[PDB]
Structures are given as structure tokens and as C-alpha cells.
């Protein structure tokens, strides 16, 4: 996260870390206590799925306290819509083995209803992003949790600032950017599958899931996050499905 | 109407003319150009959420509903919701 | 849709109204108003008009600086979004009400404790009138409208 602050512990509960055989593979947001999303790309190389563990009650990833809870990564469903290596369906939800308990650090961040998150959420300007990513494009990933409050914009405007190439694929009806041009605040590498979570007359709602796509921070760029509006449906449904016999399942979409 | 000579301001409003134009105060009620939109008329969820705290729902010639998210019930208002959980989504304990 | 477009701002002692073009064939609009840091309101709802009093919104805060969007919808399917999935809008220009708009002991439509305020109620020692050395006033730190019409 580029010109964040550290979340004050306990202050972005629903955030989630994610390793592989040890090492940081990207973040997650809680919606309930065996499902987290995150992003579809995070598995795109993934050949160790039963070294992947969900840590929730994180905050500093140098020392331990009392509040963390691991649980290793029952299922992962990404959108049959998702390509590996490109940032459109970027969302993935992820079954966890065991429930987590939810205490002052562990709370799931509401999936808000479609309509309410188009016509109410999608018109609060500030988000929350969140993560343990680099602090700076191609700098030190954080030890500290990192919240970065960004101004969402519809993809009219997004498209009317930003500069015209680079590895820039296209602002689909499946994301939304947020963020600065000006390369000062940004979501960066080691966030993706974090959330981007808005504030609406006292709860905090999933709008957005970080997503990949300019390279952190890039001046003339937005980040992009999944728009999770567009999945509400999807994930419901799966969430209320009998597991099915797969780690990485790609759920049909829509 | 055309300027104030022809009572342009409706719903009490009161004119003031200009080069031609006019300005038209409206009652805490009223606004447009001419106090013809009523204020009391779009309670619709488009707007302002409907005033629902959470989740609206326009309904067919009727009020449109206030709703809530699992874990919370609405309250009498009609527009608040109140969580039935310990840990309702959304809500971060150390800020309550 | 046809996207709007002159959005123009209107505004005399802070009666501010945006008005704009096209005028409506099958489609409705919607105006969303906001500062540069707040979420965007929305006002008119799927109207067929072309413009859209906003003065209620601009007078909580007349310093600020707000920016307006018209969307239009096809009429009948106010849900159209179009690729991106939002709906097409054109903004307007930014307006910093209390820098901006026209003036003509006056009242405007600036409100406090459900109330009107006065021209000097809004501008202080920034309102001045002339004379010759006939009256006309003037707000001589302005960069625009900085003069009004004579009586
Ligand atoms: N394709 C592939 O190798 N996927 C595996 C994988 C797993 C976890 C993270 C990445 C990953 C690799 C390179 C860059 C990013 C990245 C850039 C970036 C910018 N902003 C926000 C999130 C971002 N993530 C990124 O998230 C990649």
C-alpha cells in the first residue's frame, strides 16, 4: 500500500493474509467465518494447495500476540469466467477448513446486497484498501497492516485520466478504479485479494477486491479492484452449495 | 409563469426580480426554479438511500421498504437496523 | 443515450440551478452533485428536464467547490448502464458558489437556522458597492462576475 497508514490493529478486522508453505501470497477480506474472498490470480501458480493457510487477527507479520487465527484453505472458487494472468474476474472465495471464531480482530466485513452497493455504495467517494504489500512500487513489503483511503471513479472518468499505455488491459463492467494519478497512494504488489471496503451510515461493506493491473502507484493510473457488486449472486450461491470434490474450483460465472 | 409579474414561484415561494429574470425563495419544502418540486415527493431508494440505513426497496404505488443485512433487524423508525449478533458484519469492535 | 452536455451553471445570489442540452428524446436524466472529497447526492431524478436546481445542496457549504454529473437513461430502462456497467454522464464545470455567482441589504438563497442570509451576511467586508464614485456591487477579490448590474 503506497502512501497508506498502518490499520491500528483490529481496525480492519476482516482482513485476511494468505500463505503458501509459509510465504505471503496475497490478502482477503472475511465476509463470515469460513469464507474469505480474495483474488483469482493469487492461485494462477499455486501447486502446494494444501500448504495454503488463511490467517485472520494478523497485524504485524514480525511477532505473534494471542490473536491470530490460521486455518488452511478448504476450497478455492474462482469465476469460470477468469483467465490466469489477466485481472477480469479477479475474485476468488475461499472456503476455509474450520471456522474461525469471530472476536474483536476476526469480524467478516458485510457482502452487501447488489442494488444497495450500485445506486448507495458505488457513489460514497472513499474506500479503505488494505495489506502487508510494498510500500512503495518495487519497495519492502509492510510488516504493519497498511490502510490507504482512495476516491473511487466511474470508469468515464478513470478512462479520461489515465495516460494511454503499458501493461494496461481495458476497466471492464467487472471493475472500477480508485485511487490517485499523481503516483502518491496506491494499492501495490502483496495487496491483491485485499479488500476495498466502504463505510455507509455505520457498517463497512465489500465494494472491491485489489486487483492487479499498472504496476503499483504508476503516475497517469488508478488502481483496479474487482467489482464485487457484479459477483454478489455468485458467491451467495456458492457459499450455500454443498462442497464439491476440488481445491481450486472454477465456479461457472455468472 | 415569466418573471414575478406573472407569480412564477409556486408552492409560497417569493420572487425577485433580476434583469428580467427572477430568483424564486422557496419554502423548506420547495425548490426548483420555481418551488414546483416538493421535497416530501422522493422517497425513493435512488435517493439518499431512500433514507434507509441499510437496504431499500421501492415498492409499486406503495413506501418502499427499509431492509437489513443478516446479523440485524429494523428498528420501529422503519430505517435503522440494530445487529441480533455479537459480531455483526461491518461493525469493528474496538470502535464501539 | 446521448450524453448531456453544455452543462452550464446558472446561479444568482445563490439560487444555482445547472442547466444543460440536450433536450430529452426517450431518455431521462439524473444530476449527482458533490465537493471534491464528498460522495455525489443526486437531485432531479429521471427528469425530462434540462435543468436542475441545485442551490439546496450548494449553500450548506458555498466555499466549496462542487462538480455536478447529468446522467441519462433511456426512458422506460433507467437501469441502462452502458459497457462499464454505469450510466452515461458528462460532468459539469467546477463551481465554487461563494467565487461565482451573480449578485444583483439583499437576501440570498443561502440559509442558516432555516432562515435566508444577506448579501453581507455571505460576503462580509469582501462586498462593496459603487456609485458613480449608481449603485452597482462589487466583490472586488473575485476573479469572475466580480461586478453587478446597476439599479
Ligand atoms: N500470475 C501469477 O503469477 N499469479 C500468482 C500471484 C500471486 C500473488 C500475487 C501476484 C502478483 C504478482 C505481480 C504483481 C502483483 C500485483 C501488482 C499489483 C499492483 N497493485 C495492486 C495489487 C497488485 N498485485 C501480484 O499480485 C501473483
Same mark, same amino acid.
Given at each position: 500500500?503506497?502512501?497508506?497508514?498502518?490499520?491500528?490493529?483490529?481496525?480492519?478486522?476482516?482482513?485476511?493474509?494468505?500463505?503458501?508453505?509459509?510465504?505471503?501470497?496475497?490478502?482477503?477480506?472475511?465476509?463470515?467465518?469460513?469464507?474469505?474472498?480474495?483474488?483469482?490470480?493469487?492461485?494462477?501458480?499455486?501447486?502446494?494447495?494444501?500448504?495454503?493457510?488463511?490467517?485472520?487477527?494478523?497485524?504485524?507479520?514480525?511477532?505473534?500476540?494471542?490473536?491470530?487465527?490460521?486455518?488452511?484453505?478448504?476450497?478455492?472458487?474462482?469465476?469460470?469466467?477468469?483467465?490466469?494472468?489477466?485481472?477480469?474476474?479477479?475474485?476468488?472465495?475461499?472456503?476455509?477448513?474450520?471456522?474461525?471464531?469471530?472476536?474483536?480482530?476476526?469480524?467478516?466485513?458485510?457482502?452487501?446486497?447488489?442494488?444497495?452497493?450500485?445506486?448507495?455504495?458505488?457513489?460514497?467517494?472513499?474506500?479503505?484498501?488494505?495489506?502487508?504489500?510494498?510500500?512503495?512500487?518495487?519497495?519492502?513489503?509492510?510488516?504493519?497492516?497498511?490502510?490507504?483511503?482512495?476516491?473511487?471513479?466511474?470508469?468515464?472518468?478513470?478512462?479520461?485520466?489515465?495516460?494511454?499505455?503499458?501493461?494496461?488491459?481495458?476497466?471492464?463492467?467487472?471493475?472500477?478504479?480508485?485511487?490517485?494519478?499523481?503516483?502518491?497512494?496506491?494499492?501495490?504488489?502483496?495487496?491483491?485479494?485485499?479488500?476495498?471496503?466502504?463505510?455507509?451510515?455505520?457498517?463497512?461493506?465489500?465494494?472491491?477486491?485489489?486487483?492487479?493491473?499498472?504496476?503499483?502507484?504508476?503516475?497517469?493510473?488508478?488502481?483496479?479492484?474487482?467489482r464485487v457488486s457484479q459477483y454478489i449472486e455468485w458467491l451467495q450461491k456458492?457459499?450455500?452449495?454443498?462442497?464439491?470434490?476440488?481445491?481450486?474450483?472454477?465456479?461457472?460465472?455468472? | 409563469?415569466?418573471?414575478?409579474?406573472?407569480?412564477? !414561484?409556486?408552492?409560497?415561494?417569493?420572487? &425577485?426580480?433580476?434583469?428580467?429574470?427572477?430568483?424564486?425563495?422557496? =419554502?423548506? +419544502?420547495?425548490?426548483?426554479?420555481?418551488?414546483?418540486?416538493?421535497?416530501?415527493?422522493?422517497?425513493?431508494?435512488?435517493?439518499?438511500?431512500?433514507?434507509?440505513?441499510?437496504? !431499500?426497496?421501492?415498492?409499486?404505488?406503495? &413506501?418502499?421498504?427499509?431492509?437489513?443485512?443478516?446479523?440485524?433487524? =429494523?428498528? +420501529?423508525?422503519?430505517?435503522?437496523?440494530?445487529?441480533?449478533?455479537?459480531?455483526?458484519?461491518?461493525?469493528?469492535?474496538?470502535?464501539? | 443515450?446521448?450524453?448531456?452536455?453544455?452543462?452550464?451553471?446558472?446561479?444568482?445570489?445563490?439560487?444555482?440551478?445547472?442547466?444543460?442540452?440536450?433536450?430529452?428524446?426517450?431518455?431521462?436524466?439524473?444530476?449527482?452533485?458533490?465537493?471534491?472529497?464528498?460522495?455525489?447526492?443526486?437531485?432531479?431524478?429521471?427528469?425530462?428536464?434540462?435543468?436542475?436546481?441545485?442551490?439546496?445542496?450548494?449553500?450548506?457549504?458555498?466555499?466549496?467547490?462542487?462538480?455536478?454529473?447529468?446522467?441519462?437513461?433511456?426512458?422506460?430502462?433507467?437501469?441502462?448502464?452502458?459497457?462499464?456497467?454505469?450510466?452515461?454522464?458528462?460532468?459539469?464545470?467546477?463551481?465554487?458558489?461563494?467565487?461565482?455567482?451573480?449578485?444583483?441589504?439583499?437576501?440570498?438563497?443561502?440559509?442558516?437556522?432555516?432562515?435566508?442570509?444577506?448579501?453581507?451576511?455571505?460576503?462580509?467586508?469582501?462586498?462593496?458597492?459603487?456609485?458613480?464614485?449608481?449603485?452597482?456591487?462589487?466583490?472586488?477579490?473575485?476573479?469572475?462576475?466580480?461586478?453587478?448590474?446597476?439599479?
Amino acid at each position: 500500500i503506497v502512501g497508506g497508514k498502518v490499520c491500528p490493529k483490529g481496525e480492519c478486522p476482516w482482513q485476511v493474509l494468505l500463505l503458501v508453505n509459509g510465504a505471503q501470497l496475497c490478502g482477503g477480506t472475511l465476509i463470515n467465518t469460513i469464507w474469505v474472498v480474495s483474488a483469482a490470480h493469487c492461485f494462477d501458480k499455486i501447486k502446494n494447495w494444501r500448504n495454503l493457510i488463511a490467517v485472520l487477527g494478523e497485524h504485524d507479520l514480525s511477532e505473534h500476540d494471542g490473536d491470530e487465527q490460521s486455518r488452511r484453505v478448504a476450497q478455492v472458487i474462482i469465476p469460470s469466467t477468469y483467465v490466469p494472468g489477466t485481472t477480469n474476474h479477479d475474485i476468488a472465495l475461499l472456503r476455509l477448513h474450520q471456522p474461525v471464531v469471530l472476536t474483536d480482530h476476526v469480524v467478516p466485513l458485510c457482502l452487501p446486497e447488489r442494488t444497495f452497493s450500485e445506486r448507495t455504495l458505488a457513489f460514497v467517494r472513499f474506500s479503505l484498501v488494505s495489506g502487508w504489500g510494498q510500500l512503495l512500487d518495487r519497495g519492502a513489503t509492510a510488516l504493519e497492516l497498511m490502510v490507504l483511503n482512495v476516491p473511487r471513479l466511474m470508469t468515464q472518468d478513470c478512462l479520461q485520466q489515465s495516460r494511454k499505455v503499458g501493461d494496461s488491459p481495458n476497466i471492464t463492467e467487472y471493475m472500477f478504479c480508485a485511487g490517485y494519478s499523481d503516483g502518491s497512494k496506491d494499492s501495490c504488489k502483496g495487496d491483491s485479494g485485499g479488500p476495498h471496503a466502504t463505510h455507509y451510515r455505520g457498517t463497512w461493506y465489500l465494494t472491491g477486491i485489489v486487483s492487479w493491473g499498472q504496476g503499483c502507484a504508476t503516475v497517469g493510473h488508478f488502481g483496479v479492484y474487482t467489482r464485487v457488486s457484479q459477483y454478489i449472486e455468485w458467491l451467495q450461491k456458492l457459499m450455500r452449495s454443498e462442497p464439491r470434490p476440488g481445491v481450486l474450483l472454477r465456479a461457472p460465472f455468472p | 409563469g415569466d418573471q414575478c409579474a406573472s407569480s412564477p !414561484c409556486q408552492n409560497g415561494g417569493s420572487c &425577485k426580480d433580476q434583469l428580467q429574470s427572477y430568483i424564486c425563495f422557496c =419554502l423548506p +419544502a420547495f425548490e426548483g426554479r420555481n418551488c414546483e418540486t416538493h421535497k416530501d415527493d422522493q422517497l425513493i431508494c435512488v435517493n439518499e438511500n431512500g433514507g434507509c440505513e441499510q437496504y !431499500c426497496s421501492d415498492h409499486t404505488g406503495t &413506501k418502499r421498504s427499509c431492509r437489513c443485512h443478516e446479523g440485524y433487524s =429494523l428498528l +420501529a423508525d422503519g430505517v435503522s437496523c440494530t445487529p441480533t449478533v455479537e459480531y455483526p458484519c461491518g461493525k469493528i469492535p474496538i470502535l464501539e | 443515450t446521448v450524453a448531456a452536455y453544455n452543462l452550464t451553471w446558472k446561479s444568482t445570489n445563490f439560487k444555482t440551478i445547472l442547466e444543460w442540452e440536450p433536450k430529452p428524446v426517450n431518455q431521462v436524466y439524473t444530476v449527482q452533485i458533490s465537493t471534491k472529497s464528498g460522495d455525489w447526492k443526486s437531485k432531479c431524478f429521471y427528469t425530462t428536464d434540462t435543468e436542475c436546481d441545485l442551490t439546496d445542496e450548494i449553500v450548506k457549504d458555498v466555499k466549496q467547490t462542487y462538480l455536478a454529473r447529468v446522467f441519462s437513461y433511456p426512458a422506460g430502462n433507467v437501469e441502462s448502464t452502458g459497457s462499464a456497467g454505469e450510466p452515461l454522464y458528462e460532468n459539469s464545470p467546477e463551481f465554487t458558489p461563494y467565487l461565482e455567482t451573480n449578485l444583483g441589504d439583499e437576501r440570498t438563497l443561502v440559509r442558516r437556522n432555516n432562515t435566508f442570509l444577506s448579501l453581507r451576511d455571505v460576503f462580509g467586508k469582501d462586498l462593496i458597492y459603487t456609485l458613480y464614485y449608481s449603485v452597482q456591487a462589487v466583490i472586488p477579490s473575485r476573479t469572475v462576475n466580480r461586478k453587478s448590474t446597476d439599479s
